[PDB]
Design a binder for this molecule. Structure first.
Ligand SMILES: [Zn+2]
Ligand SMILES: [Zn+2]
Ligand SMILES: [Zn+2]
Lengths: 96, 156, 96, 84, 82, 71
């Protein structure tokens, strides 16, 4: 029951699944909702690449940290592979 | 409904349903003590179904939920509580009204059973949980927020 | 199955359709006119809310689904003071 | 009534017995584990009862339970309605 | 095998009914003779189960041990409620 | 694997304390003396009538060997 925040440019996808599951379908759940070729994806958690057959529970994050308010954000990238390029959220207008 | 539409108010600012939900209502020493119990489940249920102002506030700033959670006998007539709590939440009665002395009725539950009932009837909701923070930290809402949101913040 | 939400500041947020259906406005916008009857994307634009608050409700959308009525030890919501009074202009527009 | 496609794969005939006025009890622990076929069923019903009926501890009784059995491993002949 | 403890269950329950029976009697009677109290407990409980004398004797002692009631100082037969 | 199974339910009132272990009755109904249910530092809920009479006998909680005090 780990909660994710997949990021790729301005596009951001929220994701929740169990930890004991490979990141293969994690590359494919975005593939189904982006209508793009599947093999071009390359997930980048904390600016590093990880095995497609490896589970996301072993990818670095746990459920006790990735609660929905602050989910374990990850960066997505597509083959041109190519480095992760995400857009950070804009700062709110600060109080005077 | 005619009386409620006219909406009488007590000296202490209590509305009619507020007088229905409290426990310190004086009862006459004659046979009314036999039958006129307070808080009464049927009385509050019929008043709310009749069209009572469920979000009516008193001069002390509390709502009906604030008064009913403060009952001194939670496990003596718990079913009545289990009725009235499922009554008010069924029609208005914001569970986090946060009376004018910055007290949500959950903090004024003063009883584990009553707060369990309220938490089961509480709702993961809007800018009420997303307003307790903005009224705890004094952020200027004076015409910085919509007009109905003025009273929305004034509650929350 | 999934819905797309476009923020004012270019950011696009994609979350589960059921999770975004907890707010009445999204239910209203996805229904009737402007339904965008593709049953897979159902993108909706939001030119008023900034990116972070749209991310914040997307955090809150999954928060409500997980904790409707279960796990009585309910975790609270860390609303930032700098994001306060900004989400206070959003949920009424969303009818959460 | 739920928004999503809620299909349980199981039909119900529930006898929601009241409090201790009923004479049957279960004094031994006898923690019979919920079958995973009907685990989605009991979680849906527990969520249903705890929402429409607040403040109710649905203590399930399985020693006087009832229900049918399917024997698809053998080849599914007939039906059987032995205890849970 | 299970029906004999149900007989003991109401027998346990009838003692609890017996204990509550003496208390409401002595709330108004204050002090009462034991022989009159034997008829008095039976009189109200006759609508339900008929209590034998042996069950009453131990229920007086249990109520005495609980110190809801005790024997009167003037007469050991007479009982005093507190 | 299943089509029409269902069991028998049994619901209490989500009360953390089951019974008043003085009169051995429920907490919802009145006391044997009469209503008012007290609490203790040992987190045990008995009637005020059942406890005020208990402290005359002994100032000890009936379940655990602990000195009873009010709440
Ligand atoms: Zn008692
Ligand atoms: Zn009493
Ligand atoms: Zn104790």
């Amino acid at each position: 029951d780990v909660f994710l925040m997949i990021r790729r440019h301005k596009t951001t996808i929220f994701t929740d699944a169990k930890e004991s599951s490979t990141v293969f379908e994690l590359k494919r759940i975005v593939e189904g909702i982006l209508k793009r070729p599947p093999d071009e994806q390359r997930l980048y958690k904390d600016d590093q690449l990880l095995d497609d057959g490896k589970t996301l529970g072993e990818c670095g994050f746990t459920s006790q940290t990735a609660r929905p308010q602050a989910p374990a954000t990850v960066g997505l990238a597509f083959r041109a592979f190519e480095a992760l390029c995400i857009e950070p959220f804009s700062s709110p207008p600060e109080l005077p | 409904y005619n009386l409620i539409h006219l909406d009488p108010r007590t000296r202490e600012g209590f509305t009619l349903l507020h007088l229905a939900v409290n426990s310190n209502t004086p009862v006459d020493d004659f046979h009314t003590n036999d039958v006129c119990s307070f808080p009464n489940a049927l009385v509050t249920k019929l008043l709310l179904d009749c069209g009572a102002e469920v979000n009516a506030v008193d001069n002390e700033g509390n709502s009906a939920l604030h008064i009913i959670v403060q009952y001194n006998r939670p496990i003596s007539d718990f079913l009545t509580l289990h009725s009235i709590i499922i009554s008010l939440v069924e029609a208005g009665a914001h569970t986090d009204m946060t009376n004018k002395q910055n007290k949500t009725p959950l903090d004024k539950s003063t009883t584990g059973v009553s707060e369990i009932l309220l938490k089961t009837q509480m709702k993961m909701s809007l800018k009420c949980l997303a307003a307790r923070a903005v009224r705890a930290n004094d952020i200027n809402y004076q015409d910085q927020i919509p007009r109905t949101l003025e009273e929305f913040v004034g509650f929350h | 199955m999934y819905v797309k939400l476009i923020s004012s500041d270019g950011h696009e947020f994609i979350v589960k359709r059921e999770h975004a259906l907890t707010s009445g406005t999204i239910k209203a916008m996805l229904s009737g006119p402007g339904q965008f009857a593709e049953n897979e994307t159902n993108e909706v634009n939001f030119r008023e809310i900034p990116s972070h608050v749209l991310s914040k409700v997307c955090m809150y959308f999954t928060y409500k689904v997980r904790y409707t009525n279960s796990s009585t030890e309910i975790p609270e919501f860390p609303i930032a003071p700098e994001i306060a009074l900004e989400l206070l202009m959003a949920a009424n527009f969303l009818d959460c | 009534n739920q928004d999503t496609v809620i299909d349980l794969g199981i039909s119900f005939q529930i006898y929601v017995l009241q409090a201790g006025a009923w004479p049957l009890t279960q004094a031994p622990s006898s923690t019979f584990a919920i079958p995973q076929e009907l685990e989605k069923s009991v979680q849906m019903f527990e969520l249903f009862y705890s929402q429409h009926f607040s403040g109710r501890k649905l203590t399930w009784l399985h020693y006087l339970c009832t229900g049918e059995v399917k024997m698809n491993y053998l080849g599914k002949p007939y039906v059987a309605m032995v205890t849970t | 095998q299970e029906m004999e403890q149900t007989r003991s269950a109401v027998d346990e329950d009838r003692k609890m009914y017996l204990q509550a029976a003496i208390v409401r009697i002595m709330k108004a009677r204050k002090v009462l003779r034991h022989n009159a109290l034997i008829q008095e407990v039976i009189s109200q409980s006759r609508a339900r189960f008929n209590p034998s004398i042996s069950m009453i004797k131990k229920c007086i002692e249990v109520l005495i041990d609980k110190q809801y009631i005790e024997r009167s100082q003037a007469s050991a037969d007479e009982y005093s409620y507190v | 694997e299943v089509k029409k199974w269902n069991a028998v339910a049994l619901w209490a009132w989500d009360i953390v304390v089951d019974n008043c272990a003085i009169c051995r009755n429920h907490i919802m109904d009145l006391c044997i003396e009469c209503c008012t249910v007290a609490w203790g530092v040992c987190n045990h809920a008995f009637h005020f009538h059942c406890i005020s009479r208990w402290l005359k006998t002994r100032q000890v909680c009936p379940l655990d060997n602990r000195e009873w005090e009010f709440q």
